[PDB]
């Protein structure tokens, strides 16, 4: 059965977290919207293959909103990696496989490079490396204008599956609605320049598996494909766009399980 609970870390964050299963640890880091209910179906499917799966809402977001302002303002990959290590310490997770999309992608690459003894392998999806002025400029609008604009962007531009996105349901969407202004004012100006992929040689030989959405327009994460290839990092596609865990939960779960299994084999070898 699923643990659903809260835990406080010495940096002042009260996290909402979920955990299911027994076995090697897999940790699912949310994208910038910080909403771990997006993983619900996949958590059960991955845990059923013999893994302990942990996820959580991100600081300032959803049910992890009781957090100091520094944790959700001027956010960087390296700040988020420090926060994730804090909850892994609190939960006594010594060695983890990690997944992340978007700011979660930047976070898991920063985790693997910064805490190599802690991270078995990292899966990154759609890692943001470019400043986008039209998203950065939402930060000066009123809260309800930001929520209306970004709710529409998520559904129509990046969900990868409008029926699955809407089917997250009213409780989830009401939490996202409150998160959009927090994300807009804390993330888009500071996350892209923090991308831990400027040093291509630091990525070479690392246990990293990179994906982009099959349906994502080529221009969105073209740079990820180039960077991964230059570094000799395994690069491939998942169905859908920015939220494969929402649009295609069973394919997502299979990818996480298979990739974790590949690294468990290689680790013993």
| CA dihedral of 16, 77, 109, 156, whole degrees rounded to 10 | 70
* Of 140 and 222, CB closest to a second copy: 222
- Whether 74 is catalytic is no
- Which structure tokens are listed for 187? 């993330």
Contact in structure between 139 and 188 (CB atoms under 8 Å) = yes
CA 222 to chain centre: 19
* Of 242 and 248, CB closest to ligand C3L: 242
Angstrom distances, CA of residue 160 to CA of 60, 71, 240, 246:
25, 29, 4, 8
Contact in structure between 207 and 113 (CB atoms under 8 Å) = no
SS3 157: helix
Of the ranges 92-100, 124-132, 162-170, 250-258, which one interacts with K ion (CB under 5 A)?
250-258
* Of 51 and 252, CB closest to ligand C3L: 252
- Which structure tokens are listed for 29? 């880091």
Which of 251, 261, 262, 264 binds K ion (CB under 5 A)? It is 251
For a second copy, the binding residues (CB under 8 A) are 212-222, 225-226, 229-230, 235, 237
**Which of these is catalytic: 35, 125, 159, 242?**
242
| Contact status: 158 vs ligand C3L (CB under 6 A) | yes
Rounded CA-CA distance 77/195 in Å is: 7
* Of 132 and 237, CB closest to a second copy: 237
Q: Which does 250 bind (CB under 5 to 8 A by kind): ligand C3L, K ion, a second copy, none?
A: K ion
| Contact status: 186 vs ligand C3L (CB under 6 A) | no
Contact in structure between 239 and 247 (CB atoms under 8 Å) = yes
Angstrom distances, CA of residue 139 to CA of 87, 142, 181:
28, 8, 7
Give the nearest distance from C-beta 221 to ligand C3L in angstroms: 6
Give the nearest distance from C-beta 79 to ligand C3L in angstroms: 13
* Of 90 and 202, CB closest to a second copy: 202
Which of 42, 71, 76, 103 binds ligand C3L (CB under 6 A)? It is 103
Q: How many CA atoms lie within 13 A of 148 on its CB side?
A: 5
- Tell me the site size for ligand C3L, rule CB under 6 A: 15
| Contact status: 128 vs ligand C3L (CB under 6 A) | yes
Contact in structure between 63 and 8 (CB atoms under 8 Å) = no
In the complex, the residues that contact ligand C3L under the rule CB under 6 A are 32, 102-103, 128-130, 132, 135, 158, 187-188, 191-192, 220, 242
Q: Tell me the catalytic residues.
A: 102, 126, 242
């Amino acid at each position: 059965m699923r643990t659903r609970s809260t835990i406080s870390t010495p940096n002042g964050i009260t996290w909402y977290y979920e955990q299911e299963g027994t076995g090697p640890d897999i940790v699912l880091v949310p994208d910038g919207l910080g909403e771990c209910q997006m993983f619900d179906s996949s958590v059960s499917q991955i845990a059923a293959q013999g893994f302990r799966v942990t996820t959580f809402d991100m600081p300032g977001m959803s049910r992890s909103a009781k957090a100091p302002a520094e944790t959700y303002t001027e956010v960087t990959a390296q700040k988020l990696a420090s926060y994730v290590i804090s909850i892994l310490d609190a939960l006594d997770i010594k060695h983890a496989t990690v997944w992340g999309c978007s700011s979660g992608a930047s976070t898991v690459v920063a985790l693997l490079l910064g805490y190599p003894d802690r991270i078995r392998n990292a899966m990154c999806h759609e890692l943001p490396t470019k400043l986008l002025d039209h998203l950065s400029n939402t930060a000066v609008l009123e809260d309800e204008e930001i929520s209306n604009i970004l709710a529409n962007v998520m559904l129509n531009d990046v969900s990868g599956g409008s029926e699955a996105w809407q089917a997250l349901g009213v409780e989830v969407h009401a939490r996202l609605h409150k998160n959009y202004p927090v994300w807009a004012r804390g993330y888009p100006r500071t996350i892209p320049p923090s991308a831990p992929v400027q040093d291509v040689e630091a990525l070479r030989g690392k246990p990293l598996d990179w994906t982009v959405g099959a349906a994502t327009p080529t221009e969105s994460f073209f740079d990820n494909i180039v960077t991964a290839t230059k570094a000799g990092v395994n690069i491939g596609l998942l169905p859908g766009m920015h939220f494969p865990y929402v649009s295609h939960p069973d394919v997502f779960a299979k990818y996480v399980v298979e990739t974790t299994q590949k690294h468990l084999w290689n680790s013993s070898s």
